[PDB]
């Protein structure tokens, strides 16, 4: 699909039995979601943006369904103000910027 | 152009006769540049950040050239990790997300 930027590029994503509204975010290296129980080991990480840093848990090899596309990669979990799909998963689904 | 996301979508912009590198950022409502002086008329503003609001200076109706595509709009100046071009200007240059 083609998503214009008149409004926030928000899409529904699925992880397991879980639905989250998430922002397609070319400004983010990583994917960060709030309030998610995820399977597997995790390691502490700190990630920054405007305002400063938050502490997150890094989970690896997490399948994420994005508009019918299967992404599998690193998902960070913590107190992000909005759920974010970053470049690590955007690349896997073939997402580009075009103008 | 078409910009892929294996690397950060950094491009050259021209603003006030200066060339700068900026990140094309679909997760940002607004355009936020690193500390710099800019032509005339700014107002204090606060923008929502990580851990709370950050102070910026808001300049309205500023010409910004992005990969040789002309935009004129609001440019915020403050403490950002990197110069960020947000949807306010991305929309003006006809930028979309595609996959």
């Amino acid at each position: 699909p083609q998503i214009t930027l008149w409004k926030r590029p928000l899409v529904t994503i699925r992880i397991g039995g879980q639905l989250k509204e998430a922002l397609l975010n070319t400004g983010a290296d990583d994917t960060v979601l709030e309030e998610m129980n995820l399977p597997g080991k995790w390691k502490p990480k700190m990630i920054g943006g405007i305002g400063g840093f938050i502490k997150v848990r890094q989970y690896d090899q997490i399948p994420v369904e994005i508009c019918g596309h299967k992404a599998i990669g690193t998902v960070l979990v913590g107190p992000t103000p909005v759920n974010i799909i970053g470049r690590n998963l955007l690349t896997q689904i073939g997402c580009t910027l075009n103008f | 152009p078409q910009i892929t996301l294996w690397k950060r979508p950094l491009v050259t912009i021209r603003i006030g006769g200066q060339l700068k590198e900026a990140l094309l950022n679909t997760g940002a409502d607004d355009t936020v540049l690193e500390e710099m002086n800019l032509p005339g008329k700014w107002k204090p503003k606060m923008i929502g950040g990580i851990g709370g609001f950050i102070k910026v200076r808001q300049y309205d109706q500023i010409p910004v050239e992005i990969c040789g595509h002309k935009a004129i709009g609001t440019v915020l100046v403050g403490p950002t990790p990197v110069n960020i071009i947000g949807r306010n200007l991305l929309t003006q240059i006809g930028c979309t997300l595609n996959f």
Partner: peptide, 7 residues
Amino acid sequence: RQANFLG
């Protein structure tokens, strides 16, 4: 690391 989104 950087998740540079803004409201």
